[PDB]
Each structure stands twice: as structure tokens, then as C-alpha cells.
UniProtKB/Swiss-Prot annotation, chain B:
It comes from the Viruses. The chain holds residues 984 to 1032 of 1273 of the full protein. The gene is S. Subunit of the fusion protein that is processed upon entry into the host cell. Mediates fusion of the virion and cellular membranes by functioning as a class I viral fusion protein. Contains a viral fusion peptide that is unmasked after S2 cleavage. This cleavage can occur at the cell membrane by host TMPRSS2 or during endocytosis by host CSTL. In either case, this triggers an extensive and irreversible conformational change that leads to fusion of the viral envelope with the cellular cytoplasmic membrane, releasing viral genomic RNA into the host cell cytoplasm. It comes from Severe acute respiratory syndrome coronavirus 2 (2019-nCoV). This is Spike protein S2'.
Swiss-Prot record, chain C:
It comes from the Viruses. Binds to host ACE2. RBD also interacts with the N-linked glycan on 'Asn-90' of ACE2. Cleavage of S generates a polybasic C-terminal sequence on S1 that binds to host Neuropilin-1 (NRP1) and Neuropilin-2 (NRP2) receptors. Interacts with host integrin alpha-5/beta-1 (ITGA5:ITGB1) and with ACE2 in complex with integrin alpha-5/beta-1 (ITGA5:ITGB1). May interact via cytoplasmic c-terminus with M protein. May interact (via N-terminus) with host bilirubin and biliverdin, thereby preventing antibody binding to the SARS-CoV-2 spike NTD via an allosteric mechanism. Attaches the virion to the cell membrane by interacting with host receptor, initiating the infection. The major receptor is host ACE2. When S2/S2' has been cleaved, binding to the receptor triggers direct fusion at the cell membrane. When S2/S2' has not been cleaved, binding to the receptor results in internalization of the virus by endocytosis using host TFRC and GRM2 and leading to fusion of the virion membrane with the host endosomal membrane. Alternatively, may use NRP1/NRP2 and integrin as entry receptors. Changing residue 2 to T: In strain: Omicron/BQ.1.1, Omicron/XBB.1.5, Omicron/EG.5.1. Changing residue 29 to P: In strain: Omicron/BA.1, Omicron/BA.2, Omicron/BA.2.12.1, Omicron/BA.2.75, Omicron/BA.4, Omicron/BA.5, Omicron/BQ.1.1, Omicron/XBB.1.5, Omicron/EG.5.1. The chain holds residues 345 to 393 of 1273 of the full protein. Changing residue 2 to K: In strain: Mu/B.1.621. Changing residue 31 to F: In strain: Omicron/BA.1, Omicron/BA.2, Omicron/BA.2.12.1, Omicron/BA.2.75, Omicron/BA.4, Omicron/BA.5, Omicron/BQ.1.1, Omicron/XBB.1.5, Omicron/EG.5.1. This is Spike protein S1.
Length: 49, 49, 49
């Protein structure tokens, strides 16, 4: 299977969308496992919203 | 430490402790062979002397 | 009120007390909260010299 998870974040949390991380997003909003397989893709969308 | 960090430290201890135990067992097998040879000689002397 | 310059940093000794670190960890204000050798959520279960 392939699962595509999607959400809005601030630029300073971009680093938290990764396995093995801690912080307000990594711990309370969106967490990846240490044994994570997949790709994290992100972009600046300030010219849209 | 939390698991992603704790496992790294544990891995080092497992490697070292497993190596130490393997060294012990190898030495006991070699020493056991020497004892076996002595016991065989003792058994021969019992029968012939 | 005032923090020292980096060339002449200050040092405060903490002793004879109860150290509750959850007030800082959960405190939402920081950009960085990075622990080395210890985990930020296990600090209250530790004792220090």
C-alpha cells in the first residue's frame, strides 16, 4: 500500500516531520516511527494562501 | 535514553558481552579436551597398572 | 532581566532543591530544546549531584 498523509505547518516545524524527532509537532500532532519507510515532501505555499 | 538512542548504547554492550562469552566458551572447549586426554590416560593406567 | 554576553557567560548553581523540568519542556516558548545523554521527558525521574 501507499499512504499519502497531508497537513499544514509553519516553516519552523518542517524539521519535525521526520522519524526519531521530538517537539510539539513530533510528539502531539504528527509522529513518524523510528523504523520509518517512506518520503517526506514539503514546499513553500505562501504564494497560494 | 529513549529507544532510538538507548538501542545504540545497548548494541555496543551486546557486542562486547557476546564476544566475552564466546571467548570463555572457546577456552573451556580447548581446556576440556586436555582434561579428556588426561582422563583417558588415567583410565588406561587403571586397567593396565 | 539581563543575560550576559557570550564572551562572558554567567553560571547559576542549582542545589538543595526539587527540579521540575516539565514546566520548561511543556512551556510552549522555546525554539530549541535539545537534550544530550538524557531524555527531556524523563528528567523528573532523575537525580543529580
Amino acid at each position: 500500500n501507499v499512504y499519502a498523509d497531508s497537513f499544514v505547518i509553519r516553516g519552523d516545524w518542517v524539521r519535525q516531520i521526520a522519524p526519531g524527532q521530538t517537539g510539539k509537532i513530533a510528539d502531539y500532532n504528527y509522529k513518524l516511527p523510528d523504523d520509518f519507510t517512506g518520503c517526506v515532501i514539503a514546499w513553500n505555499s505562501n504564494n497560494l494562501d | 535514553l529513549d529507544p532510538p538512542e538507548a538501542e545504540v548504547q545497548i548494541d555496543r554492550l551486546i557486542t562486547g558481552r557476546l564476544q566475552s562469552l564466546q571467548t570463555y566458551v572457546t577456552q573451556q572447549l580447548i581446556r576440556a579436551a586436555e582434561i579428556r586426554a588426561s582422563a583417558n590416560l588415567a583410565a588406561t593406567k587403571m586397567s593396565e597398572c | 532581566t539581563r543575560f550576559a554576553s557570550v564572551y562572558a557567560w554567567n553560571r547559576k548553581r542549582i542545589s538543595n532543591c526539587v527540579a521540575d523540568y516539565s514546566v520548561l519542556y511543556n512551556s510552549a516558548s522555546f525554539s530549541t530544546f535539545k537534550c544530550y545523554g538524557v531524555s527531556p521527558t524523563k528528567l523528573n525521574d532523575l537525580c543529580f549531584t
